[PDB]
């Protein structure tokens, strides 16, 4: 409860993360650091030279092929503990995360781990071990000299002599730095002795891990109020001279409250309070998702657990509940400000994989273990059954958690790409008759103009049955559409729309709901390959509808409008669309040529290219179908130094020379007649 005494003082806060190479001592270090006094945040109170401090250990992923996570995490912290394995030394993955910390103006401190190996396995002398440390330190300081902001290329360098380097063993719970040696008296030659005779418990208290490392933390990693003076200008795109800008610049609880969301686990959003003061029952603007909401329960962290609190000021790490669907990275503020991150594309599942248990035993909580990942991850959809997500790696993570963590031996099919269908020309008028031949509909389908589709995808024109027809009609006419036709707008559905341009059709109003259901069925599965349809306009030109509902069931109306739509589409040059990924790659400049080649080899294109000193951020787009194995390729092409990630970037038309074989595969896979249908197969004779 001394936490509340501490949160009011920015200069007493340490917002930090741990960057460790896969198996260099990360979770071990985190765990034993807390015990020494996936989690979004874990906090620690630490006494240093009389005063107490509150240190926030924020989750900081280091999977270089999930760049998005690494980058976001770095943006949240002011200081990072680089952890390097004494034996193994500075690894390529370690260089990459360090690079990201430096890019996001995060000050580094070093912890050389697994020294216990140096002592027991190799029987090194103190002299030899200190020299080993010096090459590790030299390697790290080459990274800082190369990639740190120019202001800090020398300042941010780490040195054992001032205690911006410590060394020890996370596992065996001990660490040393020279400033700890001179306020305690201990030397390194005893720790060697204590290690070699096996006196683990005396080692543990004569040179304690948490004491030495957190000393380094407090002494050398900045507080929010210190760091936000140089970090906010690099993090935020708005007017710094403004007053929301100055409120974040200085670490300001005076001001209007502004926070960023770091992670989401009811739903719980962890976040960092840049300026102002968060409060329970606080109304806020969610800047990217462009909606509004109210903060229900606020809390602060005590180690792993969240303890309810409500008025907690700038500089702190917060948990809040009931923030709607705001995803990690969103800017939350009492005002409307320029967001820290830009709006991200919507995301839809585009790869699917077939999974089963190869031991027919573990199945029913394999089926729990399936919608269990769907529990925690909305972007994961499960139907065997089928796993559908955002890409190869997104799925693989799940497949990794099922075999190892949930202990299931599993068979896994080759991945399948999810395609879509559209058309490229307008159709002639087509008639659908119900089977009983008492209801008739006359339609055309037209290619939907890009400007209208985009307007639908980005919310300007809402999905669903159209509540305000004359308003939407006017918006459509603002876009390219003929206003009079536009007024017949009825439904918008998954990137398509249905339009009624009939006049004086008695009882049309009795069947309109069924026509829309049938419309939806027609878009659910297109005529080329039963893939979902996008970018089609259906227009109802005319119709004859029976007086009496006994002659108008679903069984009459559905097949009439469904077959009409599909036949018409077949007459309009039906085509396949395929999903693309936006590819965000971070590399040392020397690899620029190689990476470009790699993107071009997968039918991709460079979109953008940003440069900062010796580092390079490139943005590309490539077909999901061409991106399998990309981690492998970009790894060797960069000697493990690429940081990268992907986002959904919508759908584009499949090139004509690739399409027929892809259609054939999809139809074969679905147990259909392999031939791409033609209008002769879908439309009825004479």
XYZ file of C-alpha atoms in Angstrom:
686
model
C 0.000 0.000 0.000
C 3.143 2.166 -0.165
C 2.353 2.021 -3.867
C -0.071 4.941 -3.436
C 2.562 6.998 -1.638
C 4.796 6.409 -4.676
C 2.502 6.963 -7.675
C 2.162 10.701 -6.881
C 5.873 11.204 -7.552
C 7.006 10.892 -11.202
C 10.698 11.119 -10.250
C 10.241 7.920 -8.213
C 8.788 5.882 -11.117
C 10.736 3.454 -13.325
C 8.919 2.273 -16.470
C 10.972 -0.552 -17.876
C 11.109 -3.746 -19.909
C 13.427 -6.768 -20.222
C 14.907 -7.680 -23.625
C 16.302 -11.198 -23.617
C 17.267 -13.421 -26.532
C 15.075 -16.552 -26.657
C 16.442 -18.710 -23.747
C 18.952 -16.125 -22.400
C 17.164 -15.902 -19.018
C 14.095 -13.667 -19.543
C 11.169 -15.207 -17.637
C 13.649 -16.479 -15.046
C 14.946 -12.940 -14.554
C 11.453 -11.419 -14.382
C 10.122 -14.074 -12.012
C 13.046 -14.070 -9.566
C 13.285 -10.250 -9.690
C 9.750 -10.068 -8.311
C 10.042 -13.022 -5.917
C 13.123 -11.177 -4.615
C 10.629 -8.749 -3.021
C 1.963 -13.607 -20.434
C 1.612 -10.706 -18.003
C 0.912 -7.166 -19.249
C 2.758 -5.650 -16.297
C 4.376 -6.601 -12.988
C 5.584 -3.933 -10.537
C 8.215 -3.803 -7.810
C 8.920 -1.465 -4.903
C 12.648 -1.024 -4.265
C 14.639 0.936 -1.663
C 17.716 2.666 -3.025
C 19.964 4.966 -1.010
C 17.219 5.621 1.538
C 14.354 6.430 -0.829
C 11.765 4.041 -2.263
C 10.920 3.595 -5.959
C 8.146 1.969 -7.975
C 9.510 0.021 -10.914
C 7.160 -1.093 -13.689
C 8.254 -4.269 -15.522
C 6.135 -4.085 -18.662
C 5.779 -7.060 -21.000
C 8.303 -6.616 -23.805
C 8.080 -9.395 -26.459
C 11.246 -10.196 -28.444
C 9.872 -12.283 -31.348
C 11.516 -10.497 -34.284
C 8.904 -11.905 -36.670
C 6.165 -10.228 -34.596
C 7.590 -6.760 -35.097
C 4.347 -5.019 -34.220
C 4.442 -6.310 -30.623
C 8.121 -5.543 -30.124
C 7.737 -2.013 -31.459
C 4.623 -1.235 -29.413
C 6.262 -2.552 -26.225
C 9.357 -0.452 -26.778
C 7.132 2.622 -27.253
C 5.640 2.039 -23.767
C 8.921 1.815 -21.761
C 11.629 4.370 -20.926
C 14.372 1.948 -20.024
C 15.292 -1.568 -20.997
C 17.440 -4.243 -19.357
C 19.360 -5.931 -22.151
C 20.093 -9.485 -21.050
C 23.054 -11.255 -22.689
C 24.146 -14.883 -22.079
C 27.773 -14.809 -20.818
C 28.754 -17.923 -22.772
C 26.784 -17.282 -25.950
C 27.420 -13.540 -26.246
C 25.443 -10.963 -28.245
C 23.167 -12.805 -30.697
C 21.523 -11.395 -33.890
C 18.070 -11.373 -32.243
C 19.544 -9.407 -29.345
C 20.976 -6.829 -31.774
C 17.537 -6.498 -33.330
C 15.579 -5.803 -30.142
C 18.326 -3.411 -28.927
C 17.955 -1.617 -32.254
C 14.221 -1.203 -31.648
C 14.760 0.129 -28.125
C 17.264 2.657 -29.456
C 14.866 3.656 -32.293
C 12.174 4.395 -29.717
C 14.497 6.472 -27.496
C 14.624 3.797 -24.784
C 17.739 3.995 -22.622
C 19.607 0.707 -22.100
C 21.233 -1.011 -19.183
C 23.068 -4.364 -19.421
C 22.771 -7.635 -17.508
C 25.200 -10.410 -18.389
C 23.508 -13.675 -17.425
C 24.537 -17.326 -16.906
C 27.913 -16.396 -15.393
C 27.402 -19.450 -13.162
C 28.317 -21.342 -16.313
C 31.574 -19.384 -16.549
C 32.374 -20.402 -12.962
C 31.401 -24.094 -12.847
C 31.705 -25.310 -16.434
C 34.770 -23.427 -17.692
C 36.406 -22.633 -14.298
C 37.428 -19.148 -15.398
C 39.362 -16.782 -13.139
C 37.923 -13.361 -12.261
C 40.384 -11.765 -14.692
C 39.209 -13.956 -17.588
C 35.568 -13.367 -16.781
C 35.966 -9.572 -16.581
C 37.631 -9.655 -19.972
C 34.773 -11.777 -21.340
C 32.342 -9.152 -20.039
C 34.367 -6.417 -21.771
C 33.879 -7.974 -25.203
C 30.134 -8.369 -24.564
C 30.035 -4.755 -23.340
C 32.091 -3.655 -26.365
C 29.625 -5.454 -28.692
C 26.635 -3.831 -26.995
C 28.323 -0.409 -27.134
C 28.988 -0.859 -30.831
C 25.199 -1.265 -31.204
C 24.543 1.915 -29.207
C 27.161 3.917 -31.116
C 25.570 2.764 -34.395
C 21.827 2.965 -33.718
C 21.171 5.274 -30.751
C 19.797 8.770 -31.389
C 22.733 11.087 -32.145
C 22.256 12.849 -28.773
C 22.958 9.633 -26.889
C 25.531 7.740 -28.984
C 28.104 8.311 -26.219
C 25.873 9.133 -23.223
C 23.883 5.926 -23.413
C 26.968 3.683 -23.620
C 27.152 1.094 -20.810
C 30.183 0.696 -18.502
C 30.786 -1.783 -15.648
C 32.571 0.904 -13.646
C 29.444 2.998 -13.030
C 27.084 0.067 -12.652
C 25.282 0.396 -15.979
C 26.425 -3.213 -16.393
C 25.747 -5.908 -13.826
C 26.509 -9.673 -14.079
C 25.285 -12.825 -12.427
C 22.812 -15.657 -12.554
C 19.058 -15.185 -12.724
C 18.568 -18.893 -12.017
C 20.892 -19.013 -9.030
C 19.500 -15.625 -7.886
C 22.697 -13.567 -7.652
C 24.185 -10.506 -9.344
C 27.128 -8.094 -9.015
C 28.051 -4.544 -10.049
C 31.077 -2.567 -8.819
C 28.945 0.062 -7.082
C 27.285 -2.760 -5.150
C 30.691 -4.208 -4.365
C 31.774 -0.926 -2.779
C 28.756 -0.413 -0.504
C 28.770 -4.011 0.606
C 32.443 -4.930 0.367
C 32.011 -8.267 -1.424
C 34.443 -9.369 -4.113
C 33.974 -11.649 -7.084
C 36.439 -14.252 -5.801
C 34.076 -15.364 -3.006
C 31.025 -15.711 -5.264
C 33.250 -18.014 -7.310
C 34.054 -19.969 -4.137
C 30.422 -19.930 -2.904
C 29.336 -21.228 -6.347
C 31.924 -23.990 -6.570
C 31.314 -25.448 -3.101
C 27.579 -25.380 -3.854
C 26.538 -22.950 -1.118
C 23.554 -21.659 -3.127
C 21.775 -20.113 -0.124
C 24.725 -17.987 1.035
C 25.415 -16.850 -2.533
C 21.763 -15.806 -2.739
C 22.008 -13.346 0.183
C 25.611 -12.142 -0.030
C 24.981 -10.869 -3.584
C 21.224 -10.694 -4.283
C 19.885 -10.540 -7.870
C 17.038 -8.126 -7.171
C 19.152 -5.786 -5.049
C 21.919 -5.256 -7.605
C 19.801 -5.128 -10.778
C 17.119 -2.796 -9.403
C 19.952 -0.591 -8.115
C 21.097 -0.369 -11.702
C 17.502 0.232 -12.817
C 16.906 3.117 -10.398
C 20.328 4.693 -10.951
C 20.567 4.452 -14.733
C 17.075 4.075 -16.265
C 15.039 7.296 -16.526
C 11.832 8.202 -14.703
C 8.718 9.151 -16.746
C 9.160 12.838 -16.002
C 12.796 12.756 -17.155
C 12.164 10.612 -20.251
C 8.944 12.148 -21.543
C 10.819 15.409 -22.203
C 12.656 13.765 -25.133
C 10.470 10.688 -25.746
C 7.106 12.426 -26.330
C 8.438 14.520 -29.251
C 9.624 11.326 -30.980
C 6.564 9.232 -30.051
C 3.748 11.670 -30.816
C 2.946 13.402 -34.113
C 0.964 16.410 -32.858
C 1.840 20.017 -32.031
C 4.381 19.870 -29.206
C 3.860 23.585 -28.429
C 0.130 22.896 -27.925
C -1.159 22.352 -24.407
C -2.022 18.705 -24.624
C 1.466 18.491 -26.121
C 3.145 20.332 -23.254
C 1.104 18.332 -20.764
C 2.600 15.107 -22.128
C 6.060 16.653 -22.615
C 6.349 17.419 -18.915
C 4.849 14.552 -16.943
C 1.677 16.368 -16.127
C -1.090 15.262 -13.827
C -2.490 18.867 -14.016
C -3.560 18.297 -17.576
C -6.244 16.633 -19.648
C -5.765 12.898 -19.247
C -4.108 11.010 -22.154
C -3.092 7.348 -22.229
C -1.979 4.676 -24.704
C -3.151 1.054 -24.565
C -0.285 -1.461 -24.327
C -2.075 -4.794 -23.946
C -5.518 -6.385 -23.692
C -6.297 -9.516 -21.678
C -14.164 -9.097 -18.518
C -11.749 -7.451 -20.972
C -8.768 -5.694 -19.341
C -6.745 -2.912 -20.978
C -3.359 -2.121 -19.544
C -1.998 1.288 -20.495
C 0.440 4.105 -19.850
C -0.758 7.471 -18.559
C 1.224 10.193 -20.426
C -0.425 13.303 -18.921
C -3.351 14.252 -16.701
C -5.041 11.810 -14.360
C -7.092 8.721 -15.097
C -10.206 8.252 -12.962
C -12.843 5.573 -12.529
C -16.033 6.624 -14.267
C -14.195 8.811 -16.762
C -15.545 9.489 -20.242
C -12.896 9.374 -22.963
C -12.373 9.434 -26.716
C -10.911 6.382 -28.457
C -9.061 8.188 -31.229
C -8.333 5.424 -33.785
C -11.565 3.453 -33.476
C -13.241 6.878 -33.584
C -15.872 5.888 -31.042
C -16.370 7.103 -27.487
C -16.535 5.332 -24.143
C -16.345 5.565 -20.374
C -13.701 4.047 -18.082
C -15.383 1.694 -15.611
C -12.902 0.366 -13.035
C -9.400 1.861 -12.833
C -6.554 0.017 -11.099
C -2.827 0.030 -10.543
C -0.526 -3.014 -10.373
C 1.059 -4.717 -7.353
C 3.423 -7.287 -8.821
C 1.186 -9.528 -10.940
C -2.164 -8.602 -9.339
C -4.341 -5.609 -10.191
C -5.618 -3.707 -7.154
C -8.535 -1.337 -7.598
C -7.728 2.348 -7.337
C -9.271 5.258 -9.221
C -7.385 8.574 -9.205
C -3.867 7.658 -10.412
C -1.659 10.366 -12.024
C 0.663 10.828 -15.021
C 3.798 8.659 -15.191
C 2.088 5.484 -14.032
C 1.105 2.171 -15.623
C -2.647 1.542 -15.372
C -5.233 -1.226 -15.759
C -8.791 -0.282 -16.794
C -11.920 -2.278 -17.553
C -14.779 -1.870 -20.032
C -12.938 -0.097 -22.822
C -15.111 -1.693 -25.463
C -12.998 -3.232 -28.367
C -10.150 -0.746 -28.339
C -7.201 -2.834 -29.446
C -3.660 -2.588 -28.163
C -1.964 0.573 -29.375
C -4.982 2.853 -29.311
C -4.764 6.377 -27.974
C -7.299 7.084 -25.193
C -7.852 10.761 -24.240
C -10.273 13.257 -22.620
C -9.761 15.422 -25.705
C -9.521 14.548 -29.391
C -5.801 14.392 -30.152
C -3.574 13.122 -32.943
C -3.114 9.423 -32.103
C 0.258 7.855 -31.204
C -0.335 5.078 -33.755
C -2.190 5.601 -37.066
C -5.481 3.856 -37.868
C -4.930 0.206 -38.819
C -6.772 -1.680 -41.584
C -9.749 -3.726 -40.358
C -8.337 -7.327 -40.475
C -10.225 -10.432 -41.613
C -9.175 -14.101 -41.385
C -7.309 -15.058 -44.594
C -5.560 -18.391 -43.930
C -7.054 -21.640 -42.740
C -5.524 -24.898 -41.624
C -6.934 -28.402 -41.063
C -6.159 -29.853 -37.623
C -6.857 -33.109 -35.789
C -5.552 -35.088 -32.811
C -3.436 -38.032 -33.997
C -4.064 -39.779 -30.716
C -7.823 -40.184 -30.535
C -7.873 -39.494 -26.771
C -7.228 -35.798 -25.917
C -10.055 -34.637 -28.136
C -12.833 -33.089 -26.124
C -10.624 -30.445 -24.448
C -8.714 -30.231 -27.673
C -12.097 -28.922 -28.813
C -12.020 -26.840 -25.630
C -8.348 -26.097 -26.430
C -9.554 -24.867 -29.802
C -12.279 -22.309 -28.954
C -9.992 -21.570 -26.032
C -7.558 -19.806 -28.334
C -10.697 -18.241 -29.836
C -11.622 -17.155 -26.276
C -8.531 -15.020 -25.958
C -8.033 -14.045 -29.602
C -10.978 -12.518 -31.510
C -8.936 -12.631 -34.740
C -8.891 -16.413 -34.484
C -11.909 -18.272 -35.814
C -12.426 -21.987 -35.389
C -15.091 -24.166 -37.341
C -10.858 -31.376 -37.794
C -12.122 -28.444 -37.009
C -10.649 -25.543 -39.038
C -8.242 -22.919 -37.754
C -8.647 -19.571 -39.525
C -6.544 -16.534 -38.764
C -4.440 -13.680 -40.117
C -1.468 -15.558 -41.491
C 1.034 -18.373 -41.262
C 2.739 -17.223 -38.049
C -0.493 -16.150 -36.334
C -1.756 -19.725 -36.661
C 1.600 -21.395 -35.961
C 1.646 -19.782 -32.514
C -1.601 -21.524 -31.760
C -0.376 -24.823 -33.158
C 2.679 -24.349 -30.878
C 0.560 -23.762 -27.784
C -1.582 -26.815 -28.496
C 1.199 -29.378 -28.933
C 3.565 -28.126 -26.204
C 1.454 -26.297 -23.621
C -1.754 -28.355 -23.974
C 0.207 -31.522 -24.729
C -1.621 -32.636 -27.886
C 0.104 -34.503 -30.718
C -1.609 -33.097 -33.830
C -1.776 -33.479 -37.599
C -1.832 -30.218 -39.554
C -2.707 -29.800 -43.237
C -0.958 -27.452 -45.621
C -2.484 -23.978 -45.121
C -5.265 -22.800 -47.406
C -5.690 -19.207 -48.581
C -9.156 -17.651 -48.375
C -10.140 -16.015 -51.696
C -12.967 -13.766 -52.839
C -14.962 -13.240 -56.044
C -16.124 -10.223 -57.983
C -16.982 -9.034 -61.465
C -15.463 -6.586 -63.899
C -18.271 -5.588 -66.366
C -22.013 -4.902 -66.146
C -24.424 -7.703 -66.961
C -27.367 -7.895 -69.274
C -30.760 -8.162 -67.487
C -31.376 -11.570 -65.979
C -34.599 -13.207 -64.791
C -34.981 -15.487 -61.813
C -38.235 -17.465 -61.559
C -39.329 -19.305 -58.417
C -39.783 -23.080 -58.971
C -43.610 -22.733 -58.798
C -43.289 -19.972 -61.428
C -45.535 -17.405 -59.696
C -42.759 -14.936 -58.765
C -40.224 -13.364 -61.094
C -37.326 -10.973 -60.591
C -35.388 -8.987 -63.185
C -31.883 -7.865 -62.198
C -28.539 -6.595 -63.292
C -25.236 -6.796 -61.485
C -22.615 -4.071 -61.844
C -18.970 -3.754 -60.762
C -18.872 -1.595 -57.649
C -16.675 1.501 -58.110
C -13.586 1.524 -55.826
C -14.658 4.792 -54.259
C -17.920 3.248 -53.071
C -16.375 0.002 -51.816
C -13.760 1.921 -49.834
C -16.545 4.115 -48.444
C -18.202 0.944 -47.210
C -15.076 -0.626 -45.798
C -14.092 2.487 -43.833
C -17.523 3.046 -42.333
C -18.744 6.165 -44.142
C -21.511 3.963 -45.556
C -22.690 1.549 -42.813
C -23.165 -2.183 -43.169
C -26.567 -3.743 -42.853
C -30.139 -3.178 -43.843
C -30.247 0.553 -44.748
C -31.851 2.597 -41.949
C -31.593 6.008 -43.644
C -32.138 5.443 -47.392
C -32.347 9.083 -48.522
C -29.203 9.991 -46.561
C -27.127 7.068 -47.852
C -28.419 7.669 -51.373
C -27.082 11.201 -51.223
C -23.719 9.948 -49.962
C -23.571 7.397 -52.779
C -24.339 10.131 -55.304
C -21.533 12.218 -53.761
C -19.352 9.262 -54.726
C -19.784 8.393 -58.401
C -23.338 7.000 -58.311
C -26.389 8.205 -60.202
C -28.583 9.729 -57.499
C -31.944 8.506 -58.780
C -30.755 4.882 -58.935
C -29.046 5.478 -55.561
C -32.341 6.234 -53.875
C -33.384 2.598 -54.253
C -30.568 1.552 -51.900
C -31.803 -1.269 -49.676
C -28.973 -3.308 -48.210
C -25.245 -3.279 -47.736
C -23.617 -6.595 -47.108
C -20.002 -7.657 -46.836
C -18.775 -5.268 -49.546
C -21.819 -5.547 -51.790
C -25.131 -3.767 -52.046
C -28.637 -4.489 -53.161
C -30.705 -1.805 -54.906
C -34.448 -1.682 -55.709
C -35.167 0.359 -58.843
C -38.605 -1.111 -59.463
C -41.767 1.022 -59.535
C -45.352 -0.074 -58.916
C -44.667 -3.733 -58.155
C -47.572 -4.771 -55.939
C -46.487 -6.833 -52.918
C -42.777 -6.382 -53.586
C -42.761 -5.172 -49.951
C -43.977 -8.632 -48.905
C -40.882 -10.348 -50.327
C -38.115 -7.754 -49.817
C -36.811 -9.464 -46.633
C -36.514 -12.832 -48.415
C -34.844 -11.193 -51.429
C -32.231 -9.737 -49.050
C -31.689 -13.147 -47.405
C -31.208 -14.607 -50.902
C -28.922 -11.712 -51.859
C -26.867 -12.627 -48.804
C -26.755 -16.293 -49.790
C -25.629 -15.322 -53.277
C -22.757 -13.180 -51.796
C -21.836 -15.814 -49.198
C -20.757 -18.171 -51.987
C -20.003 -16.863 -55.473
C -20.484 -18.819 -58.725
C -16.798 -19.245 -59.578
C -15.665 -21.165 -56.545
C -18.165 -20.610 -53.712
C -15.823 -17.972 -52.216
C -17.292 -14.866 -50.597
C -18.252 -12.109 -53.051
C -17.029 -8.486 -52.842
C -17.598 -5.300 -54.864
C -20.910 -6.205 -56.537
C -24.012 -4.091 -56.972
C -27.249 -5.965 -57.442
C -30.037 -3.859 -58.898
C -33.629 -5.041 -59.027
C -35.137 -3.610 -62.222
C -38.521 -5.295 -62.196
C -40.528 -8.071 -60.551
C -43.813 -9.937 -60.446
C -44.937 -11.099 -56.993
C -47.840 -13.371 -56.131
C -50.837 -12.048 -54.150
C -50.678 -14.836 -51.653
C -47.917 -15.886 -49.278
C -48.827 -19.565 -49.752
C -47.157 -19.192 -53.140
C -44.120 -17.237 -51.821
C -42.066 -19.263 -49.392
C -38.337 -18.949 -48.747
C -38.239 -22.032 -50.969
C -39.651 -19.965 -53.819
C -37.946 -16.602 -53.383
C -34.446 -17.738 -52.361
C -33.642 -19.832 -55.412
C -35.143 -17.252 -57.783
C -32.942 -14.354 -56.659
C -29.929 -16.528 -55.884
C -29.674 -18.113 -59.335
C -30.447 -14.837 -61.060
C -27.587 -13.133 -59.218
C -25.132 -15.947 -59.922
C -26.089 -16.316 -63.610
C -25.814 -12.544 -64.118
C -22.424 -12.457 -62.437
C -21.273 -15.263 -64.772
C -22.156 -12.983 -67.677
C -20.077 -10.118 -66.271
C -16.512 -11.513 -66.449
C -16.410 -13.045 -62.977
C -12.941 -12.909 -61.439
C -11.104 -14.023 -58.300
C -9.618 -11.662 -55.694
C -6.810 -12.628 -53.328
C -5.745 -11.180 -49.968
C -2.632 -9.024 -49.523
C -0.494 -8.318 -46.502
C 1.099 -5.048 -45.682
C 4.663 -5.958 -44.835
C 6.578 -3.801 -42.336
C 10.281 -4.570 -42.288
C 12.971 -3.024 -40.111
C 16.615 -3.628 -41.134
C 20.241 -2.443 -41.054
C 20.718 -0.578 -44.363
C 23.172 -3.152 -45.741
C 20.308 -5.602 -46.318
C 18.079 -3.204 -48.314
C 18.914 -4.711 -51.681
C 18.431 -8.279 -50.519
C 15.118 -7.565 -48.850
C 13.757 -5.787 -51.914
C 14.631 -8.767 -54.075
C 12.870 -11.019 -51.595
C 9.663 -8.971 -51.786
C 9.695 -8.779 -55.588
C 10.241 -12.548 -55.797
C 6.905 -13.004 -53.993
C 4.894 -10.819 -56.411
C 5.242 -7.970 -53.977
C 5.872 -4.280 -54.281
C 7.677 -1.708 -52.206
C 5.232 0.955 -51.164
C 7.302 3.147 -48.907
C 10.816 3.564 -47.562
C 11.902 5.460 -44.477
C 15.438 6.061 -43.303
C 16.996 6.978 -39.946
C 20.764 6.986 -39.944
C 21.945 3.447 -40.575
C 18.543 1.814 -40.150
C 15.824 1.314 -42.735
C 12.091 0.788 -42.449
C 10.442 -0.489 -45.585
C 6.763 -1.022 -46.262
C 5.652 -3.507 -48.902
C 2.564 -5.347 -50.102
C 2.474 -8.984 -51.205
C -0.194 -11.664 -51.833
C -0.864 -13.797 -48.735
C -0.505 -16.773 -51.139
C 3.088 -15.698 -51.817
C 4.083 -15.085 -48.152
C 4.393 -18.636 -46.694
C 7.913 -19.238 -45.403
C 8.755 -15.543 -45.381
C 10.309 -15.637 -41.898
C 12.838 -18.107 -43.237
C 13.656 -16.112 -46.328
C 13.975 -12.721 -44.714
C 16.064 -14.277 -41.902
C 18.803 -15.631 -44.165
C 18.687 -12.548 -46.367
C 19.409 -10.397 -43.288
C 21.506 -12.833 -41.218
C 18.771 -12.791 -38.597
C 18.699 -9.019 -38.280
C 15.301 -8.241 -39.823
C 12.466 -7.104 -37.612
C 9.157 -7.536 -39.467
C 5.394 -7.997 -39.220
C 2.280 -8.034 -41.413
C -1.153 -6.461 -41.437
C -4.205 -7.249 -43.544
C -4.218 -4.985 -46.592
C -7.508 -5.981 -48.251
C -8.081 -7.942 -51.464
C -6.855 -7.389 -55.034
C -7.766 -9.124 -58.312
C -5.842 -12.304 -59.092
C -3.734 -11.969 -62.264
C -5.490 -13.617 -65.232
C -2.676 -16.136 -65.965
C -2.800 -17.515 -62.378
C -6.539 -17.587 -61.862
C -7.769 -20.698 -63.696
C -5.444 -23.035 -61.843
C -6.327 -21.401 -58.501
C -10.061 -21.709 -59.134
C -9.503 -25.366 -60.072
C -7.701 -26.023 -56.765
C -10.373 -24.328 -54.678
C -13.184 -26.231 -56.365
C -11.266 -29.532 -56.214
C -10.604 -28.927 -52.525
C -14.278 -28.306 -51.874
C -15.219 -31.545 -53.643
C -16.816 -29.695 -56.557
C -16.406 -30.250 -60.296
C -12.903 -28.734 -60.832
C -13.678 -26.777 -64.027
C -14.297 -23.083 -63.488
C -18.017 -22.831 -64.241
C -19.078 -20.738 -67.250
C -22.416 -19.050 -67.751
C -23.451 -22.237 -69.636
C -23.068 -24.203 -66.366
C -24.833 -21.672 -64.134
C -27.461 -20.105 -66.376
C -30.411 -22.238 -67.560
C -30.886 -23.200 -71.228
C -32.923 -21.109 -73.705
